[PDB]
Every structure is written in C-alpha cells, then in structure tokens.
C-alpha cells in the first residue's frame, strides 16, 4: 500500500516526525507522497523526501495559497521539480467551498501550474471542492499534454467521478469514507471507481477515520492509519485488501513513475 496524501511538513508532526514515518512503515505502508501546499511548504517537503526512504514530494501552490502567486514563483517550483524527489506538480486546483483566495487568483494559479506540468511533462496533484464544472473547463486544454493526473481527496458525486475517470484522472480516496456522518455518498460510489484509477491516502494530519477503535486521544491523523482505510475500502468494494493494495500501488507507480 502507498499513501499519496501526507502533509508531513505540518507542525503537528514536529515533535515526532521520525517516529510518525517509522511507524507507518512498520504498519505495512510502502511509501509516502509528501504534500507541498505552497512554495515554502513545497521546499520543506523536498527536504523531508531526502530525509526518509521511499518518500517523494509534490511542488505547487494550494488554491488556498493561490494569492501568493507571482512571476518569480513559477521558476521557483521548477528549480524544485528538477529534484528526483519531486514527482508531481501540486497541490493545485479549485476550492470554492471557501473564500480564502479569490476564485480569480485560484484559477490563475491553477492554469499557471497546469502550464508548468505541461512544460516539464509532469503529472498533477489536484484539489477540487464545490468547483467541479469550473475544474474540468480549465483542465480541458491542458490535460492532454500531461502524463497523468490525480484528483486527491475526492468528495464529489458518482457522476462527477465517472466524469473525471473518463479523462484518465485518478480518484484519491481518504478516511472521509470512514465517516458515518458525511461519508455515505462516497462509500456507495466506491465500487464504481475503476480499480486502476483508485488511489488511497490519509490526508494527514486531517480526516482521522471516525470508525477507528479505540480513538487516539490526540485525534491527529497519520499515515500509520492507512491500512485501516484500505481494509474498509476493500470491504466496501468486495475485494481482498492484499489484491487492492497490489493494484493501488501499481497506480502510484504508473502515475508518478516511482518504485517501492
């Protein structure tokens, strides 16, 4: 199994980042994709990717930080992407559920990073919340020039899922599906996701699975909870956890071009 959603730069892991990484590996996790959310966090993720074996990173600007985008920013992401630890351009995309950055500059910073991925021939680590239609319009002229793409932390509908998959977009599934409150719609579309478009992640330190027993006092998510998520996903697909692990790991290698 592989975790494509680890925000390891987070200050929540500051006290025990080594132990966090080590424990995940001791649970069956075969690799980590350390998420970069802005220029500064992308540079830190590249440093952590050298620090640990079987760890890579993404370089990009989150739609939440899309207001930070300048002309000096592009080349800065490229100096970082040149590293053999950086395998994806992201996290980038649209987030209209919030207002942290104006949708004008969200869109601008999204297309800019999409152009970068086309220039360097790299896959993208995408983010989309309540912005599906505007998402596919901006992706439309760029996607055919990219190796691949992933809609990580997908929370949309099954129609939206089939809309993305039709264009070769990998669907990322977190422990959001483990929430009884607001994970009903997701769990029912899970068997419809083509197994070779499925990717598993934790989005640590967020989206700690609610069906965990017992619950950690801290309630901080970590990549050591990935096997739990795969098992639930496999069960809700009527699959063997070992089989889906071998498939989801192939998808990681196919999309990112890494080995573990």
Residue numbers in the entry: 1 to 260
What do the authors report?
TatD is a conserved protein widely expressed in different species, including bacteria, fungi, plants and animals.
The simulated annealing omit Fourier map (2Fo − Fc) of the bound DNA revealed weak electron density for the three nucleotides (5′-G-p-C-p-T-3′). The 8-nucleotide single-stranded DNA was likely digested by TatD and resulted a 3-nucleotide DNA. Alternatively, it is possible that the 5′ end of the DNA was disordered and only the three nucleotides at the 3′ end were observed. Superimposition of the apo-form and DNA-bound TatD gave an average RMSD of 0.394 Å for 259 Cα atoms, suggesting that DNA binding did not induce any major conformational change. However, a close look at the protein–DNA interface showed that the loop with R98 and F100 moved toward DNA in the TatD–DNA complex structure, and as a result, the two residues, R98 and F100 were disordered and refined with an occupancy of 0.79 and 0.85, respectively. However, no metal ion was identified in the TatD–DNA complex structure and DNA is bound loosely between two TatD molecules in the crystal, indicating that the 5′-G-p-C-p-T-3′ was bound in an inactive conformation.
